[PDB]
Design a protein around this ligand. Structure first.
Ligand SMILES: Nc1ncnc2c1ncn2[C@@H]1O[C@H](COP(=O)(O)O)[C@@H](O)[C@H]1O
Ligand SMILES: Nc1ncnc2c1ncn2[C@@H]1O[C@H](COP(=O)(O)O)[C@@H](O)[C@H]1O
Ligand SMILES: [Cl-]
Ligand SMILES: [Cl-]
Ligand SMILES: [Cl-]
Ligand SMILES: [Cl-]
Ligand SMILES: [Mg+2]
Lengths: 305, 294
């Protein structure tokens, strides 16, 4: 149902962004007590969701793996309804998607340890093909976390070769220790992700905790050392710090905070949307923060802004 | 939060049944489309739930393992509301319970898989219980070591006079292989006084010629009372070499057979605990299941 536009050998009618990672079934409190609404979310998927709203004229694709059950079909449908191109989704027979439940104090429970999405880097050829004509390929530290050793290698090799042909690679380290076997493995693998990326979107609070960065500018230096060309350091309610080809700066973030979920994912979409438009980095960061600011004044992961 | 009665050295004021296995979170459709109601279920827990309803005068305990998150605490509270003694539940920090959505399942990493991790805790749960009930699902979710631990505790309990009841409850998807499944089920039979197989599932996997052959297979494993369920057909039984059949009264307006076996099992065990003859207990069990399927 989603319009993929047209193409010739040289150009496509639509700008193309690919997001790679895991989308999950989400059950969140409904109005009637004891009941829950079924939706879909997951960090990289949320970013794609916001992108589709920001640029409905563009092609926003999602690459992942789902099962073959009712719930998987439901997820596939929800993607199309959101204007997201799920044509590349791998189907893994006998399996289902990951799920999480929000209970309400607000708490989360996850069942994603055996999700189909963990097989998303099982087919190297399908990955390359998904990336081949993408203007931007976006992935996260959660994308890396859920894969085994071979899957990580396959994904990183694909991103690196895509990068070399001229795809712009964007990465949100999105540190979630509970998804990794150990902190050593997490930090190492995250920086492997950095080494294939042009744009990195770390969050200072998390980076400081695990890498021992003394401040946001030290966070930026760390990613620049891995070859990242544009580092954008998200910083809670504080100014966003950046570092691009040796040049530094800070972009003020106006004071606005119901729900800091989706903040980072919406920020990323706002940033990538503006970068694709050919806007200078500082302009893109301002747009990213403006979107995130309006989102954190909203209810949920997916806030119709 | 559930009264457990009183005791002296010789007798307890309440008869005591312990069920061992996995309780899961269940999400089922509510009226509002796209919304689901959260409840708790799972084979051995369902049997315990029905048993508690049938005998408010008794102590119905559940032994399992849960997590330490909000959902696990909700499960604990639901058990207590249902009159079930969850005082022996083990808590596995960082883990959560299994879940299913209406059937799609997430149970491969549930805390309940650790329920046989502490041998002393299992033995204490079984002490002074009159009946200990478990299923083939209880066995399926454990690793090899947990299986050995549980079976050894069950056999030791049986050696001390606890009555052991088993429902094979064959579920192929939960096992690594067909062979492992059949061998382990029969190991469960080997520690059980009472077995409650279902002919439809047994026949597909053991090659039983008919319900009497199913009964014979369990009897060779040392089961004293075998009660073979068979959908709407007569229940066959075998007890100490004596065969019999008990009719299942026809039910026309059938609605949901999911809890049929678990409610049958509770009905049977309730009547056995009351000292009713096996044929009487089977009829009581059929009657309850009949109401439940409607
Ligand atoms: N308390 C807040 N006040 C204003 N903006 C925020 C706040 N929290 C998050 N944001 C925005 O969301 C982005 C993501 O921040 P982070 O949560 O550190 O990933 C920030 O860079 C801001 O643009
Ligand atoms: N179609 C049916 N009509 C009447 N009773 C049933 C039916 N299905 C199941 N039951 C009852 O539930 C018990 C267990 O069913 P099953 O475990 O599916 O063989 C039977 O022994 C009957 O007492
Ligand atoms: Cl985490
Ligand atoms: Cl006393
Ligand atoms: Cl099964
Ligand atoms: Cl008898
Ligand atoms: Mg009664």
């Amino acid at each position: 149902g989603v319009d993929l536009g047209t193409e010739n050998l040289y150009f496509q009618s639509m700008m193309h962004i690919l997001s790679i990672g895991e989308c999950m079934a989400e059950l969140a409190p409904a109005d009637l007590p004891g009941t829950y609404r079924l939706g879909f979310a997951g960090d990289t998927f949320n970013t794609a969701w916001y992108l589709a709203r920001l640029r409905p004229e563009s092609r926003i694709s999602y690459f992942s793996a789902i099962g073959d059950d009712a719930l998987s079909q439901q997820m596939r449908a929800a993607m199309s309804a959101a204007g997201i191109d799920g044509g590349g989704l791998r189907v893994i027979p006998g399996r289902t998607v990951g799920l999480y439940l929000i209970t309400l104090e607000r708490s989360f429970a996850y069942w994603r340890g055996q999700s189909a999405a963990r097989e998303l880097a099982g087919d190297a050829d399908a990955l390359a093909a998904a990336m081949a004509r993408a203007d931007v390929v976006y992935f996260s530290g959660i994308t890396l976390a859920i894969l085994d050793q071979c899957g990580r290698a396959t994904l990183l090799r694909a991103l690196a070769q895509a990068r070399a042909t001229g795809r712009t690679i964007a990465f949100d380290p999105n540190l979630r220790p509970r998804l990794w076997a150990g902190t050593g493995e997490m930090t190492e693998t995250i920086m492997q992700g950095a080494a294939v990326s042009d744009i990195a979107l770390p969050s200072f609070e998390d980076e400081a905790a695990w890498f021992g960065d003394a401040g946001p500018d030290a966070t930026a230096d760390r990613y620049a050392r891995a070859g990242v060309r544009s580092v954008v350091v998200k910083n809670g309610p504080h100014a966003v710090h950046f570092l691009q080809d040796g040049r530094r700066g800070r972009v003020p973030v106006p004071p606005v905070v119901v729900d800091t979920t989706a903040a980072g994912d919406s920020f990323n979409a706002g940033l990538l949307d503006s970068v694709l438009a050919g806007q200078p980095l500082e302009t893109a960061i301002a747009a990213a923060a403006a979107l995130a600011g309006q989102v954190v004044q909203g209810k949920g992961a997916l806030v119709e802004v």
